[PDB]
Symmetry: C6
Subunit: 210 residues, 6 copies
Amino acid sequence: PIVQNLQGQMVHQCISPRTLNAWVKVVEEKAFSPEVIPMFSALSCGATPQDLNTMLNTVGGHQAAMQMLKETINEEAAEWDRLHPVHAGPIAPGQMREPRGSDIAGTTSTLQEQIGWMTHNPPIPVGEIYKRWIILGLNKIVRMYSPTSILDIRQGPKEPFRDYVDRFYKTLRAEQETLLVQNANPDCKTILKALGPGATLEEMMTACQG
Amino acid sequence: PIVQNLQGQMVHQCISPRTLNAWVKVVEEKAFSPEVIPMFSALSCGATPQDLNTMLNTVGGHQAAMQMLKETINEEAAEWDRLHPVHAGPIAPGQMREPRGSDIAGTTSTLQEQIGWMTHNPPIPVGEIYKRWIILGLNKIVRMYSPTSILDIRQGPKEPFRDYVDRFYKTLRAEQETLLVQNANPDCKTILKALGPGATLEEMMTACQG
Amino acid sequence: PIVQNLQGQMVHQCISPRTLNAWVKVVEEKAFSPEVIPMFSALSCGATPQDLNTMLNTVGGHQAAMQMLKETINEEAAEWDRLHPVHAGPIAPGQMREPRGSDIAGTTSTLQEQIGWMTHNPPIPVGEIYKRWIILGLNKIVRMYSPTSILDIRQGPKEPFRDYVDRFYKTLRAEQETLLVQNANPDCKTILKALGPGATLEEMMTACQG
Amino acid sequence: PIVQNLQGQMVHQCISPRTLNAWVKVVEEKAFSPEVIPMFSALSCGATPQDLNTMLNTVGGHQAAMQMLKETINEEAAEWDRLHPVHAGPIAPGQMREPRGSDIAGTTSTLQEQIGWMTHNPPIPVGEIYKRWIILGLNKIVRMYSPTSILDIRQGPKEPFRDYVDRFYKTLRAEQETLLVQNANPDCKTILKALGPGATLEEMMTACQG
Amino acid sequence: PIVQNLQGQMVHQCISPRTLNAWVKVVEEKAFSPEVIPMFSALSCGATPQDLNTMLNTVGGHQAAMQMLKETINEEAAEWDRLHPVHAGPIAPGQMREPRGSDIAGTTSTLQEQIGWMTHNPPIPVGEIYKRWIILGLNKIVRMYSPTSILDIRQGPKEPFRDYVDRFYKTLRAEQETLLVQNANPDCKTILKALGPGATLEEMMTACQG
Amino acid sequence: PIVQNLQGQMVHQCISPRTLNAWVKVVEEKAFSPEVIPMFSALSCGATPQDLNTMLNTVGGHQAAMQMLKETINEEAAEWDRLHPVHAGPIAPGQMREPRGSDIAGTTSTLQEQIGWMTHNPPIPVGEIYKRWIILGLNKIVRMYSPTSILDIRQGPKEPFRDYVDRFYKTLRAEQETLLVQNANPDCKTILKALGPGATLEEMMTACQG
Ligand SMILES: Cn1nc(NS(C)(=O)=O)c2c(Cl)ccc(-n3c([C@H](Cc4cc(F)cc(F)c4)NC(=O)Cn4[nH]c(C(F)F)c5cccc4-5)nc4ccccc4c3=O)c21
Ligand SMILES: Cn1nc(NS(C)(=O)=O)c2c(Cl)ccc(-n3c([C@H](Cc4cc(F)cc(F)c4)NC(=O)Cn4[nH]c(C(F)F)c5cccc4-5)nc4ccccc4c3=O)c21
Ligand SMILES: Cn1nc(NS(C)(=O)=O)c2c(Cl)ccc(-n3c([C@H](Cc4cc(F)cc(F)c4)NC(=O)Cn4[nH]c(C(F)F)c5cccc4-5)nc4ccccc4c3=O)c21
Ligand SMILES: Cn1nc(NS(C)(=O)=O)c2c(Cl)ccc(-n3c([C@H](Cc4cc(F)cc(F)c4)NC(=O)Cn4[nH]c(C(F)F)c5cccc4-5)nc4ccccc4c3=O)c21
Ligand SMILES: Cn1nc(NS(C)(=O)=O)c2c(Cl)ccc(-n3c([C@H](Cc4cc(F)cc(F)c4)NC(=O)Cn4[nH]c(C(F)F)c5cccc4-5)nc4ccccc4c3=O)c21
Ligand SMILES: Cn1nc(NS(C)(=O)=O)c2c(Cl)ccc(-n3c([C@H](Cc4cc(F)cc(F)c4)NC(=O)Cn4[nH]c(C(F)F)c5cccc4-5)nc4ccccc4c3=O)c21
Ligand SMILES: [Cl-]
Ligand SMILES: [Cl-]
Ligand SMILES: [Cl-]
Ligand SMILES: [Cl-]
Ligand SMILES: [Cl-]
Ligand SMILES: [Cl-]
Ligand SMILES: [Cl-]
Ligand SMILES: [Cl-]
Ligand SMILES: [Cl-]
Ligand SMILES: [Cl-]
Ligand SMILES: [Cl-]
Ligand SMILES: [Cl-]
Ligand SMILES: [Cl-]
Ligand SMILES: [Cl-]
Ligand SMILES: [Cl-]
Ligand SMILES: [Cl-]
Ligand SMILES: [Cl-]
Ligand SMILES: [Cl-]
Ligand SMILES: [Cl-]
Ligand SMILES: [Cl-]
Ligand SMILES: [Cl-]
Ligand SMILES: [Cl-]
Ligand SMILES: [Cl-]
Ligand SMILES: [Cl-]
Ligand SMILES: [Cl-]
Ligand SMILES: [Cl-]
Ligand SMILES: [Cl-]
Ligand SMILES: [Cl-]
Ligand SMILES: [Cl-]
Ligand SMILES: [Cl-]
Ligand SMILES: [Cl-]
Ligand SMILES: [Cl-]
Ligand SMILES: [Cl-]
Ligand SMILES: [Cl-]
Ligand SMILES: [Cl-]
Ligand SMILES: [Cl-]
Ligand SMILES: [Cl-]
Ligand SMILES: [Cl-]
Ligand SMILES: [Cl-]
Ligand SMILES: [Cl-]
Ligand SMILES: [Cl-]
Ligand SMILES: [Cl-]
């Protein structure tokens, strides 16, 4: 990634073995659960497009999702080229050429070009632009691999209300209010109806706390 | 987080894989026990609002508590906006706009704006303000998920007094003096009554030490 | 803690996840054995009062001992206030107010005040003063939770003298010379009596080495 | 590897025990799966030819592949010598001799010569040139040890389409579009034919999602 | 320990949790085998007397050996006082008082006094002097706890010569040439006698290699 | 080891607990396999003679090999003394005396003398000279402890050619071309004879790939 050292300059440093292993492990142990996205965004802090491709390449298996990720990146890169057509001409000394979509994706750009864009003044954050495309595609993976719809999350007759709300918002986070009351069991729903339409979650969970 | 480097300047650096995993692990292995709060406060030392949301997002499961956390943050952010109304006008060069509630929560603020507020002189500690809101909500989770009341923590007829005091103040810490004597078993309570009203805990535990 | 960076200035840095976990683990795996005290003193090297409270707060369970620790800290803080009464008056620019007992314990003092006292010239080491109070209370926990008295550590008829001395000074360290000879078995005691009153431990262990 | 320190100079530093163990472990636990290549490229970030040989030497077993790696490196080194014949003559002060093929492979070059080439201005990146040769040979190992051809990856009659696409692109990545439709089971292939020739992967996987 | 930072000054830094745990673990898993001594000497690199006492204090159990260690340190400290009597008088500004034996052992000396002696010019290496006393006592522990004498290490009739030499020099290292030939089995001893009196170990092991 | 800090000066720093444990572990888990040598050479990057002795001393067991290592070091040190006789005379200020063989081996040299030689200009790399002697002796250990000769590595009648070449070059690496064809099974040898005398390994392995 590109980090700031002891001085005020942004400097490239190698991706660490701890970061490489942390990303490989969270994919192996959690697949494409919703919480894998912010872990990816945090592990790729300040990452260049090269580091982003590195993290995606080190993932073995789930190649259907990774291939869908390539398709999403290609779509966003093509939209970037439509909005930012490169203007031909010799690049002035001490400057950087305009990045294409494949340059932001690290396909047709070298490392020192990515360093040049990210450490430029003003910077061209090709890492954050690429990560935005990757997270966009990864969110498409999560909603797609979400097994349960929110309409099917119903509280059991003897299920504690806390466990039901745990399953409700876990499913809701994957699929990406008043349904929480409707899908509660008869005994809890009677308590929630008499509680009021503007009750908070802690007020509702306290009322059905058995 | 925002840290001080070799020079005297406060500088942003990426959240470490060790910090990310340490927070995910303590939630998996201890849920919402009272000691999880100071671990969160320590793991988020110097954290920006972005790092605070990152730590909260990486938590899979317990979404009922995390949704209640969003409600608490929204309440505190709305109270911040009531106390600090943003005054319109162009921002002077080399300065920062006034943060809203959603800016402190990292919702409507970029990373370099959070860096700008936290490294300002005088600093606007949006990280400490947000962490104060998160810890406030997390404390509401702990007292809510506390299973046992302090009125039900009683010393067994053959339970050692040390183990009883261990259960007493562990329960008292979750729920957030003279009850300790009243809930002791008959044999120990006789010893404590004749000991005096101003006895310390080590004096009481020594007297009932069997 | 407060550490010295590349320059000669003492600078605050966040407590590390390794230090946080190392302290939580040694308490879980060794409770209040005597060797837990120097591990605490080493893990809290250069710690502020905030870091000291953090380490104590992250400990789940053993709340009877931790509550006794609060009582000891309150006693030492009250003695500090008796010896150092704060004199009222406006604090001069670039200076620090006099700390109270609760300020050294981190109760009524902010982090930058603790940084101000510890990095002052001359420094007010509120961290070392607080740690001295904590170690004092922790030593009261160790002697109190010591199960065996030194009078009951006797060498078995067939117990090797090395194992007996191992149990003797382990018990003696928890409770905090000529008794070692008296509590030896008859065969070893006969050897030690004829050895001389000023024999060293390696001379005594060699003589009873069987 | 050669890294940039606090100043702007590229400086050699020793290969870390974490990097050494991370490379040994991924070879032991994944052999020559496709994802081992980008892990090697990332673990050898900024590596000198000496570090590259070190990583290859620490691998025990798989010596057939490692011997094939030597043959590939010898071929690329001989092509480098054909394209870059060394011109004899005394080397000017403060300069570097032209590297041979065996110099880039770390065979006939010392460490400070590799430091001299890599930290030169303009630099002679003997590390990136050698790594390019190693990755080239390692890719020959992957395609060679690929057990299954893409023609034999067919969807089972009851196999979920997601699992079939997972096996398809995993095999395709090792061997290095319309075949995905042809190798689908009859029920899914009927759905894909009526879907259109320009359907994306997420559009195809959604249509056969059962 | 006392380490050199980015500048040329020797600066104190806290003992790390990794060093603390590494020393506790090697004592738990290897007790007082000979190889524990160089691990101690390496883990205490640049250690102050405070760090040396910390490492010794964190060791739970083996208190018979640790008590013998105190006796050895007291003997060496008393010999230091006999050779270096402290001369009374006011200490000049910016200087250090002469250390006693208990000052080198960290008993009657503060941390900043140990920093003052070790970072002095010329330095008074109280850490290396104390470590020399500790290693001296620890070597007395190893030879004392050595279970087997070198006279009893004999090669079995069917024991491979390599395994016999492994046991021979392992025992010899704990107790601290021609006996290796005499304690070999009859078949190997016949080969070694006809080999010559000045044969090397690899020449002897090759001759009895079966 | 001796490393370069933020400035351009070579500075000593303590051997890390990670390096100490990594060397102890690879010896415990791999003994004297060929791949242990480059792991030793990498873990001792920039090591002083003191660090080299430390790594060798921390190895428990295998004392027959370690004693043979002492004999090899003594031979190379005696050859160094024959080639470099020390010339008597007072050492000029700010200079270093000429090292003997035992000085390079760390036997009769202090740490600051090793620092003086290694950080000299021009440097006397006593660490690399000693490591060259240690690796030389360690290679004698590997060839000596190699159990199988290359003449006995033959392909089984049903053994896959890949597994046979894996055993061939693994044995060849320990003992330190046309024999690979001669030791193949009859069916594979018929294929290799008709393939040509100048076939590469990947060409031969592909031809016998069954
Ligand atoms: C190769 N490349 N090609 C693309 N688009 S394209 C014309 O349509 O094919 C594409 C795009 Cl958009 C983005 C980036 C890459 N990129 C990758 C990618 C990263 C990646 C992106 C992603 F979104 C998911 C993912 F896992 C990895 N690594 C691979 O793709 C590896 N891989 N290989 C095959 C093939 F064998 F079947 C795969 C099937 C799924 C994954 C496969 N590494 C690199 C390594 C070194 C130097 C450059 C690059 C590089 O530039 C791009
Ligand atoms: C999205 N956002 N929205 C809020 N308030 S609001 C209008 O009423 O909805 C809200 C508030 Cl107050 C604070 C902060 C966020 N924030 C989050 C939050 C953090 C968070 C706070 C918390 F207190 C608990 C927690 F776990 C996480 N992450 C999420 O909330 C993830 N998540 N998603 C759903 C949905 F799918 F059901 C959830 C249900 C429980 C948790 C859910 N990440 C971000 C990631 C990148 C850039 C910005 C942000 C961000 O700004 C805020
Ligand atoms: C709260 N506070 N109060 C005290 N003294 S007082 C009036 O008589 O109550 C007291 C004292 Cl003397 C010292 C320091 C604290 N301090 C603690 C303490 C540390 C601590 C000290 C100790 F010696 C043992 C220990 F484990 C933790 N954390 C707690 O005490 C947590 N805790 N809570 C309850 C209650 F719910 F039953 C407990 C029962 C045992 C432990 C409990 N964290 C803090 C976190 C953030 C900002 C400030 C603080 C703080 O200032 C002090
Ligand atoms: C020795 N050397 N020789 C080559 N080419 S050559 C004339 O035809 O033989 C060759 C080439 Cl091309 C590249 C580099 C090396 N190099 C190696 C290599 C690295 C390596 C490359 C590779 F592509 C695969 C791999 F695993 C390791 N280490 C070895 O090869 C170890 N090894 N030894 C035998 C023998 F005993 F059978 C082996 C059989 C397979 C691996 C073997 N380490 C070194 C260690 C210290 C100082 C220099 C060097 C060095 O310069 C080169
Ligand atoms: C206390 N002190 N006293 C000595 N000599 S003396 C008059 O004859 O008793 C003695 C000597 Cl010579 C050297 C150093 C110490 N020192 C220790 C020692 C270290 C130590 C040395 C050693 F060689 C072995 C070892 F394990 C630890 N820690 C202890 O000794 C802990 N301990 N306590 C008892 C008692 F309860 F039985 C023990 C029995 C065996 C170990 C015991 N920590 C300290 C912690 C904080 C501030 C100062 C100190 C300190 O200055 C010295
Ligand atoms: C002691 N010393 N002596 C040698 N040569 S000599 C006259 O003929 O005996 C010899 C040589 Cl050539 C090289 C270096 C050492 N050196 C060692 C050595 C390293 C070492 C070298 C090696 F090649 C293998 C190995 F494992 C360790 N550590 C030891 O040898 C430990 N050890 N002890 C006995 C005895 F008890 F049987 C052993 C039997 C096998 C290993 C033994 N540590 C030290 C620790 C602190 C300060 C100095 C030193 C030191 O200078 C040298
Ligand atoms: Cl790392
Ligand atoms: Cl995976
Ligand atoms: Cl794969
Ligand atoms: Cl831009
Ligand atoms: Cl409930
Ligand atoms: Cl569910
Ligand atoms: Cl609840
Ligand atoms: Cl990390
Ligand atoms: Cl969880
Ligand atoms: Cl979730
Ligand atoms: Cl403010
Ligand atoms: Cl009790
Ligand atoms: Cl309970
Ligand atoms: Cl008690
Ligand atoms: Cl850490
Ligand atoms: Cl605990
Ligand atoms: Cl608790
Ligand atoms: Cl003071
Ligand atoms: Cl004994
Ligand atoms: Cl006992
Ligand atoms: Cl003994
Ligand atoms: Cl490391
Ligand atoms: Cl392997
Ligand atoms: Cl091998
Ligand atoms: Cl070039
Ligand atoms: Cl499917
Ligand atoms: Cl398959
Ligand atoms: Cl699907
Ligand atoms: Cl650490
Ligand atoms: Cl132990
Ligand atoms: Cl103990
Ligand atoms: Cl001295
Ligand atoms: Cl043998
Ligand atoms: Cl034995
Ligand atoms: Cl042998
Ligand atoms: Cl370390
Ligand atoms: Cl071993
Ligand atoms: Cl040994
Ligand atoms: Cl030389
Ligand atoms: Cl094969
Ligand atoms: Cl074999
Ligand atoms: Cl093959």
